[PDB]
Every structure is written in C-alpha cells, then in structure tokens.
Amino acid sequence: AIPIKHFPKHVADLHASNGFTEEFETLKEFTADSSNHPDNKHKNRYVNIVAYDHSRVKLTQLAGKLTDYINANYVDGYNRPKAYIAAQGPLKSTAEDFWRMIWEHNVEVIVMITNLVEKGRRKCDQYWPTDGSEEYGSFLVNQKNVQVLAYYTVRNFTLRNTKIGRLVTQYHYTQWPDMGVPEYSLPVLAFVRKTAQAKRHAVGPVVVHCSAGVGRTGTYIVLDSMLQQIQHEGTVNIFGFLKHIRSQRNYLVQTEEQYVFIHDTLVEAILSKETEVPDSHIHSYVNTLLISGKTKLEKQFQLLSQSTALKQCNREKNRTSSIIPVERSRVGISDYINASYIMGYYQSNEFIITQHPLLHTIKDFWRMIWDHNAQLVVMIPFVYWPNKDEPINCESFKVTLMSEEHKCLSNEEKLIVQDFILEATQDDYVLEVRHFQCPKWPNPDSPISKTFELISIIKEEAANRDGPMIVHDEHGGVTAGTFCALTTLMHQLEKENSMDVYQVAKMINLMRPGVFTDIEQYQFLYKVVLSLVS
Amino acid sequence: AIPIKHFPKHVADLHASNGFTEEFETLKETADSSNHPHKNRYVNIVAYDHSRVKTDYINANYVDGYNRPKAYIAAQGPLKSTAEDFWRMIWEHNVEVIVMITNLVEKGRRKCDQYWPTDGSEELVNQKNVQVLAYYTVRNFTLRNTRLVTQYHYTQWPDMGVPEYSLPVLAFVRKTAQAKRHAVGPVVVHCSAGVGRTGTYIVLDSMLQQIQHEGTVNIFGFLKHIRSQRNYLVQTEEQYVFIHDTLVEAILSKETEVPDSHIHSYVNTLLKTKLEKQFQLLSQSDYSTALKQCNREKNRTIIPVERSRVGISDYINASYIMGYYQSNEFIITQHPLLHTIKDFWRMIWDHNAQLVVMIPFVYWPNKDEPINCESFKVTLMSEEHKCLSNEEKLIVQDFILEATQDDYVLEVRHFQCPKWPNPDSPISKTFELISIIKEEAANRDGPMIVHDEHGGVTAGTFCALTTLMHQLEKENSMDVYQVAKMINLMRPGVFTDIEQYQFLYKVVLSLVST
C-alpha cells in the first residue's frame, strides 16, 4: 500500500521503469459449472467469458429445463464485502432475468459503462423503455425522469413485480471510447464521484455492467473503491485490491491500458481533491485558495498545465503556431481547419473554439458550421460574412444575410445580432445561424457582475438552437475559453447548485492547450463565479 | 413529346450539348394561408393556395399525374407539431399510400420527424407489418378516427445530390406503382422540404405510365405543368438530369422482373436477341475513378471503383455489393496477398462480418499460431468437412477475433468451396451450395465477404444467385437483368462475357421445378 503522499511519484516511476507491464503480466494467473451448462448457452454474450460459482449470482428457480442462471458475480469493495454485482450487458434473451436480478437482490443503483451500439456493433441490448413503460416478463419498468449530460446520463425508473413501486436509478457513462481508455481521466473521475455520492444512500448492492462485464466494469470497481480508501484511510492499493477481486470474477480490468489508466486517474484525484463546490461553500472555498508549500490557486493552476499536430504544409492556414488544435479535439471539415471541440455541461462537443478567419479560411469556417450543423456563433474581438449585396458561395451551400439588430447592454456596449441561412446547392436543407459580435469582453472597467449578462443572453439563445456553439476570439485562446468556461459554470450552478471551476478549466485546457497559460485568468474565473452567488 | 424510340438518343444529345442547364434555367420562371401567424420546415418553402390541401393548414399540395388529375399529394416531411395534421390529412383525403423519399436523420441533420410507431401503437396509428429491404422499407399501418395504410420508405437516397445508380430508384417506383394501381384515393408523397425528391418521384412515376400506355415521354412538358401546383418540384439540375437517365434505363430495360409462372416463357424469349440486348446494357452515364498510386502493389491484377470501394481504417481491393436485404449485403474482393492478409482480417473486423465464402494459399491461423493484428487476435476454433451430393468437400472453419484493447469477440465462419460451379456435375447441384450458405447467413449479422482469385465472375455469380434465391423465395419474382447490372456497376469487370450472364438465367430456370 502506498500513501496518497507518494502515489503520484510512485505512478510516474512505473511509467519510467515500464513497470506496469511486469505488474500486469504477474496478475494474469489464475470452476464455472453452472455457466457452462448447455441450458445456459444463449445467456452468455461470449463463450470465453464466465461467472465463477462461488461468486455467481443465483436467482430463484421457477417453471423441463433450468431457470436460476445469470452471467454476474458479487465482488467486494474496499473493506465492504459483496458490494457490487459485476455483470455482463443484458441480451434480449436475458433482459427479464436481469430485471429479476434487480428485484431479487434489492438493487437500486445500476452503473452502465457502455453504449448499446459502438461503431456498428451490438455491445448491449436496451433493457429499459425510452417510452413511458415496457414489460420484461413478470417485471414492469416505468421510466420517470431522464437527465442527459456531456459524459453520462441519469435515468430514474420504477419497478413492479407484476404478480402483486420501487425506485431504481441508472447511471450511464456514455462517452467511453470504442477501443482503449478515455483520453481524459478527469470526466470518468467525476462520474464515479457523482455515482459514489448517490450510491452512499442505497441499501442493496450496486449492479455494474459493460458489454462483457470484465474490463470496463472492473475498472469502475477499482476506481470507486480506491477512491473510498483515499477518503477514509489515506492510502491506495490497486494491485493488492485488484488481485483479490480477480478471484470473484475473471478478467476484471482486462487490458494493460485500463490498469495504467486507473493509476493516472487516481493520481489526478489525489492532487485535485474534491473541487466541486456547493452553493453554501463558494465563499469559504474561494478564499481558501489564496492564503503545503504554496496556495491552492497555484497548486490547482499547475494541474491545468498537463500530443500530435497536423501543421506541416497546411500550416499557412493558422494565425499563430501558439494556439493550434490537438488531434484528440481537432475539428474535422470534410479537409483541415484550426479548431478544437470543447466540452460543456450537456454535451462533449458543446462548443468549438477556433481562430478568426483568415481570408482563405473564410470558406472553411462556414463549411465547419455547415458540417457540424451549428446555429450559434459567438465572436469576441475583419468581416468574413455576406451582405445582401453579395451572398457567400460555397460549393455545397450558399451563405446569406437575413437580419441584423444592435442591442445596448446595461453599460451601453453593443451586441451585433445577425441572422443567416445556409441553403444547400445540392439538396433542400436550410441551416439557420445566429451571429453575435461582442464588445471588448470581459470589459474589466465595467464591473464583474455585468460579465455574466452577456453569457445569460447567449445561454437562452443556445437552448432553442441545436448543434454546437462556434466561439472565436482572435486566436481561439483565453477569451473564447473563459466564455465556454463561464457558460458551462452558469449551467452547472443553475442545475446542480455546484461549481467545479478546476475541472472546467482543465478539461478546456486539455482539449485546447494554451487557452489558460496564466493564473490571473484562472483566478478570474473564481472571481466572476462568486459574484453570481448573491 | 419524344417517343421512347428517340428518347434514349435525345437524352445523350442533352449530355453532349450541355442542354440540360438551358432546359432547367428556362424552367425557373400565391401563398396567403401558408404565410399566416410553426408548421413550415423552411421559410422559403410554401404551399400554393389553389393546390394546397385543407386549424385547416398543412404544407402540402395536390399535384396531377399523367392524364390523372389531383393524383398525388406532394407534401413536406412532418414535424412533431404537424404529425397529427398529417394523419388527419390521411383520414380526410382517403389516402392509403404514402411514399417517403428521405430518412429521419441524414449525416446528423433532422430531415423528417418520425410520425409513426416503432412499437405496437401511438396516437390512432397501430403498426401491423414491416419489411426492410436493401433500398426501401414497407410498413403496413392501420388507422382509426378516435382502415389499412401502407408506407413506402425509399431509404438509401444519398445525403446531397442524386443516387449514383438509377436502377434501384426505378424498381422502387415500379414496386410502389404496382401496389398503388388499385388504391382509390390520392397517394401522399414526401421528402424533407417536399420539393425536389418528392417532385422527382411524381415525374418518374407518371412518365413511366406514359411510356406504358402512350409510348411517349414528356418530362419538360409535364414538369412545367406541375410546377404550377407546387413550387421547386425537381429542385436541382442534377435531379432533372437524373430523371432522364433513369427513364432512359427503364425504356431500354422494359420490365425485367419475372414471376414464378412466366420464367419459362421469358427465358426462351431471350434467344439482336434480348440476351444480347440486355447483356449490352450491363456494360455501362456516371463516371469511374480507380486508385492506382504507389499502393498499386496491393492488387493482383479487377479493381474497385470509389462508389463501391471498401474502406478499412486504409486501402484494400474490395467493392461493396448489394443484395436483396441490404445495400452492402456482400463484399467482393481478391484472395489475400501475403501483405494484404492483415488488411483482409481488419476488413472483417471493421464491417463486423460473420461469413466468408471462398471459391477456387492459406491466409488463416492454425491452433499452432493465431494471427496477431494490432486491435485484435484471429484464432481457429473449429474445422468440419461436409460431403455434398456429388462427394465434394465444403471446408467449414469457425474463427474468433478478440479485441486486444477491448472485450469484444467476433465469431466468423469460413467456407472453402470446391470447383464452383462444377460444370461436370449438372446445373441442379450449383444451387445446393448457395442454399447451404443462405441459411447460415440468415442467423449471422454483418456483410458476406466473398472472394475468388480476383473478385471477378465466380464471386459475382455467387452474390447474384444468392440474391436471386432470396428474391424468388420471398417475392416469387426474379430480376436477373437488374441483379447482374447492379453487380457490374458496383464492380466493373465481373461480367464481361455473355455465357456467364446467360448462365444466370440457366441456373435460375432449373430452380423452378415442382
């Protein structure tokens, strides 16, 4: 066991010494009679994947043939035995059994780390209703509430044994990549923290699933449990803890990449602490950052600053080689443009940050809007847009100007609202864009309470609009980044009554490196956010 | 009006002289109700008052067919706000047929809102039956005012521009036109906006009927008229051009779908000859780009065209080939060269195919040594040997591809065929192979990979005859002409000789024993 003090270094030491592979190889070694019964062929997703008999979940027997089998195990959390139920992703054949499992084991929480379809593969069958209600054998699932957020989706169901309600809540980690591990550990983290908090009020065990029920599922169980170790004990033993649960279910944490990813994720958690602040504590927290060897502001700031370029012989389409997209987040026109996807509260790919068009790029910029079906553009400062004089002529569409208003804001600055249409030259489709030109923003001589007024205006507008928000300053840097931040923080406050500024900056900075390079801007975010909680 | 005699040449004359654009420009030259106080998809798109259908407003017009007035109801794609109104329209105008030439979503754009139930019922529309085929999808609904109605969903229409092939659109219209022939009310037709795509059907269906009854065809004439009943019908120049080419193909093809009853009467009539006349037509007004490059060192000789070219995550010599149930039913391709072996398996892995049919070098792993691709491992599970009715072998081997970086397992089955078709065994034993692989491919998902040496004739006849077997089984019909042409369009050089085109007819005929 390593202490939280030494785990960060200890992790870097395994990256340097290539000691993860040693450590993972050694883990590979390592009966399943029930799961190999001929009866139980069509209840297993894969033939090699199996539920060990000592740990397997048993359902009652009913009615010839057998009826008590499901591909799922009880697996022990951190000094909490038989905590999780590590289970495979239900098929249409096993949908009922899966709901019976829920009813028979008193389950209230379900943790889903997979999509139903992933690059054209059936990974998991939809075992619940999008519509009001659906009936799975004896079991009636009637969906109450749904929340869809950038990286996860919460669904509130109710359950009845039709042979006579109980509330059940599903936690859908949606954005997990189709092979490999999430390029960012920071959102997975928050998901587990979000589930871990709600799950702290559930009485039965927590069901966890992916497709197979091994890697992804296992990776949550390690990440959740170690989290709890860090809080209560101040220590962390992945290798220890993992070797144990691998007894209760096969191939938990299946790849080396997952093993490594757990480490890095937990490292980030140790150095971040919980950085989501409630309403009550904004004030108490915002002071504490500017009083270890140095301030939480410096300590957090350092962490924001943490790669493949396409910029060889198309490099004459960027303004500055200082603010330039990374392939992870790089925005793809049908080919190249300097623009990164930026995530927000509700959708990974909420915004796009990018540069102000260079004369040649003007045509690309508009194609970007057209491909991504964006209806908002926010500008924060050369005209790159058509008049009624002369519409812009892109090949597969025409850009044309419909309106132009001018709003006087509460310190008498202007908001140039113009509407547009892009009409297909080769189809019937019409895309209706709205365009904001902002003043100097944030105008730091007008007070900090009128920074938000802009953001509230553009918030409302982006509700009724679909597609992402294109936000450009000169270079796709700080001023655009603070926009996406503060919008995202406004939402996050409004809906959850919480603020995690640390996360909102870092994800931004991870997704477009060079947006936040100076602490005064990082602090500023805290500053602005505080004026909101009056 | 041009006669069908002179329409094919007349069309080529407008391609040569760039006279379609003249003809379309010239076509370019009131709506009080539609400009009232949320029921219009786009602001520029509008339903003219004299033609509009009738608290009382919906973006739809009556449009006249060929000497058949007020025949169609050319309408926009319903929004969730106008879904009801659209069903009331159906009830109030005695509609039994709906023709949908668009998807609900197209490269992430909402083009049309789903106005019907996937589940049993929604509000009263209760869905009875569904059939999903390569290029369209038939749905049978029933309707109550708190009647049977049939929807015809042309699914594969490309996201901007016109279908690269006119041959499947044709067949769709012919399929709808036949069922619609004993509907008494009007036929509702829609796309997203309700103008180009919708309009292009109405011209294509009606001219079809002109050709059958009158032996003439007047698009420009007929079009100029209906453009009075609704704005922008046939919206682009590409659509205008496409109608022509499509109809040209129809004139020269005639109906080539044969029922059970008439295989015998048709197969003789072919043999200047309809066989030569049809054959010529397989060898064909689009364009072609083959690559070539300094990755030309990954082909044996038969080379994919970009339309149909199969995309590994990136190049492989392989074309998508269409079948009865799915455009992209099959992939025809070459036998792997040693370097391509790794690609071949990646192809299977990307497209999630579970059947491979081989038809004559080992490119597959033993229990000795699984194949090691980066994002998966290929491994041998089974190997059976089936003795067919003239004692030849079918080498059935099963495989698994397991992800190296995930949990997924793909279960492939692999057939090595004998000499096929074995021409010393009778034609009656050709089909037995195909029937075997037919039932296997029912329970399997993903496309069928089919290779001979070069992805040529022998693989092409397989996809043909499988597709024809299905088509006979389910619809009791055979359209051999179409099945070869689509194949040949999608991978040029598969059918280069008439004896193999004929052969298809030959084989098919032996099947209709009783």
PDB file of N, CA and C in Angstrom, chain A residues 147-174:
ATOM      1  N   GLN A 147     -32.012  12.591 -17.338  1.00  0.00           N
ATOM      2  CA  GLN A 147     -31.033  13.674 -17.415  1.00  0.00           C
ATOM      3  C   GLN A 147     -29.917  13.213 -18.324  1.00  0.00           C
ATOM      4  N   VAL A 148     -29.631  13.984 -19.366  1.00  0.00           N
ATOM      5  CA  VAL A 148     -28.573  13.666 -20.325  1.00  0.00           C
ATOM      6  C   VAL A 148     -27.469  14.729 -20.257  1.00  0.00           C
ATOM      7  N   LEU A 149     -26.279  14.309 -19.835  1.00  0.00           N
ATOM      8  CA  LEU A 149     -25.157  15.209 -19.624  1.00  0.00           C
ATOM      9  C   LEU A 149     -23.970  14.788 -20.484  1.00  0.00           C
ATOM     10  N   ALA A 150     -22.991  15.682 -20.604  1.00  0.00           N
ATOM     11  CA  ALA A 150     -21.884  15.520 -21.549  1.00  0.00           C
ATOM     12  C   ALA A 150     -21.363  14.085 -21.660  1.00  0.00           C
ATOM     13  N   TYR A 151     -20.962  13.538 -20.508  1.00  0.00           N
ATOM     14  CA  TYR A 151     -20.303  12.219 -20.399  1.00  0.00           C
ATOM     15  C   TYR A 151     -21.111  11.109 -19.719  1.00  0.00           C
ATOM     16  N   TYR A 152     -22.225  11.455 -19.071  1.00  0.00           N
ATOM     17  CA  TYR A 152     -23.144  10.460 -18.551  1.00  0.00           C
ATOM     18  C   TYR A 152     -24.613  10.867 -18.661  1.00  0.00           C
ATOM     19  N   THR A 153     -25.501   9.960 -18.275  1.00  0.00           N
ATOM     20  CA  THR A 153     -26.948  10.150 -18.428  1.00  0.00           C
ATOM     21  C   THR A 153     -27.650   9.408 -17.317  1.00  0.00           C
ATOM     22  N   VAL A 154     -28.388  10.141 -16.489  1.00  0.00           N
ATOM     23  CA  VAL A 154     -29.068   9.551 -15.339  1.00  0.00           C
ATOM     24  C   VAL A 154     -30.518   9.291 -15.716  1.00  0.00           C
ATOM     25  N   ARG A 155     -31.016   8.100 -15.387  1.00  0.00           N
ATOM     26  CA  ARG A 155     -32.396   7.712 -15.676  1.00  0.00           C
ATOM     27  C   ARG A 155     -33.021   7.168 -14.424  1.00  0.00           C
ATOM     28  N   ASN A 156     -34.215   7.657 -14.099  1.00  0.00           N
ATOM     29  CA  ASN A 156     -34.913   7.228 -12.914  1.00  0.00           C
ATOM     30  C   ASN A 156     -36.077   6.366 -13.316  1.00  0.00           C
ATOM     31  N   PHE A 157     -35.999   5.104 -12.917  1.00  0.00           N
ATOM     32  CA  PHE A 157     -37.024   4.140 -13.205  1.00  0.00           C
ATOM     33  C   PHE A 157     -37.738   3.754 -11.916  1.00  0.00           C
ATOM     34  N   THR A 158     -38.850   3.041 -12.103  1.00  0.00           N
ATOM     35  CA  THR A 158     -39.572   2.377 -11.033  1.00  0.00           C
ATOM     36  C   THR A 158     -39.811   0.945 -11.484  1.00  0.00           C
ATOM     37  N   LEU A 159     -39.935   0.047 -10.511  1.00  0.00           N
ATOM     38  CA  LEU A 159     -40.029  -1.394 -10.751  1.00  0.00           C
ATOM     39  C   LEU A 159     -41.218  -2.028  -9.990  1.00  0.00           C
ATOM     40  N   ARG A 160     -41.988  -2.888 -10.662  1.00  0.00           N
ATOM     41  CA  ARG A 160     -43.026  -3.684 -10.007  1.00  0.00           C
ATOM     42  C   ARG A 160     -42.865  -5.142 -10.407  1.00  0.00           C
ATOM     43  N   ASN A 161     -43.118  -6.025  -9.446  1.00  0.00           N
ATOM     44  CA  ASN A 161     -43.308  -7.461  -9.699  1.00  0.00           C
ATOM     45  C   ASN A 161     -44.789  -7.591 -10.059  1.00  0.00           C
ATOM     46  N   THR A 162     -45.086  -7.819 -11.341  1.00  0.00           N
ATOM     47  CA  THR A 162     -46.480  -7.677 -11.845  1.00  0.00           C
ATOM     48  C   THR A 162     -47.414  -8.647 -11.115  1.00  0.00           C
ATOM     49  N   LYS A 163     -46.837  -9.719 -10.580  1.00  0.00           N
ATOM     50  CA  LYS A 163     -47.517 -10.562  -9.607  1.00  0.00           C
ATOM     51  C   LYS A 163     -47.618  -9.900  -8.227  1.00  0.00           C
ATOM     52  N   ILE A 164     -48.345  -8.777  -8.126  1.00  0.00           N
ATOM     53  CA  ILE A 164     -48.874  -8.240  -6.847  1.00  0.00           C
ATOM     54  C   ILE A 164     -50.242  -7.559  -7.066  1.00  0.00           C
ATOM     55  N   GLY A 165     -44.663   0.625  -5.894  1.00  0.00           N
ATOM     56  CA  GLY A 165     -43.455   0.637  -6.707  1.00  0.00           C
ATOM     57  C   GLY A 165     -42.187   0.628  -5.876  1.00  0.00           C
ATOM     58  N   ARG A 166     -41.068   0.359  -6.546  1.00  0.00           N
ATOM     59  CA  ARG A 166     -39.699   0.592  -6.023  1.00  0.00           C
ATOM     60  C   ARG A 166     -38.931   1.439  -7.038  1.00  0.00           C
ATOM     61  N   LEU A 167     -38.153   2.396  -6.545  1.00  0.00           N
ATOM     62  CA  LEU A 167     -37.370   3.295  -7.402  1.00  0.00           C
ATOM     63  C   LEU A 167     -35.966   2.723  -7.657  1.00  0.00           C
ATOM     64  N   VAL A 168     -35.523   2.824  -8.910  1.00  0.00           N
ATOM     65  CA  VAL A 168     -34.203   2.371  -9.370  1.00  0.00           C
ATOM     66  C   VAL A 168     -33.588   3.431 -10.271  1.00  0.00           C
ATOM     67  N   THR A 169     -32.301   3.678 -10.094  1.00  0.00           N
ATOM     68  CA  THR A 169     -31.640   4.743 -10.813  1.00  0.00           C
ATOM     69  C   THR A 169     -30.422   4.211 -11.565  1.00  0.00           C
ATOM     70  N   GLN A 170     -30.364   4.546 -12.858  1.00  0.00           N
ATOM     71  CA  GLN A 170     -29.373   4.040 -13.809  1.00  0.00           C
ATOM     72  C   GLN A 170     -28.421   5.175 -14.105  1.00  0.00           C
ATOM     73  N   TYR A 171     -27.134   4.848 -14.194  1.00  0.00           N
ATOM     74  CA  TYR A 171     -26.062   5.835 -14.371  1.00  0.00           C
ATOM     75  C   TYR A 171     -25.210   5.439 -15.557  1.00  0.00           C
ATOM     76  N   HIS A 172     -25.453   6.124 -16.666  1.00  0.00           N
ATOM     77  CA  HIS A 172     -24.990   5.703 -17.971  1.00  0.00           C
ATOM     78  C   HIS A 172     -23.738   6.451 -18.407  1.00  0.00           C
ATOM     79  N   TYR A 173     -22.543   5.879 -18.187  1.00  0.00           N
ATOM     80  CA  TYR A 173     -21.343   6.555 -18.663  1.00  0.00           C
ATOM     81  C   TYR A 173     -21.308   6.345 -20.158  1.00  0.00           C
ATOM     82  N   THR A 174     -21.600   7.415 -20.896  1.00  0.00           N
ATOM     83  CA  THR A 174     -21.900   7.318 -22.321  1.00  0.00           C
ATOM     84  C   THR A 174     -20.693   7.460 -23.233  1.00  0.00           C
TER      85      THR A 174
END
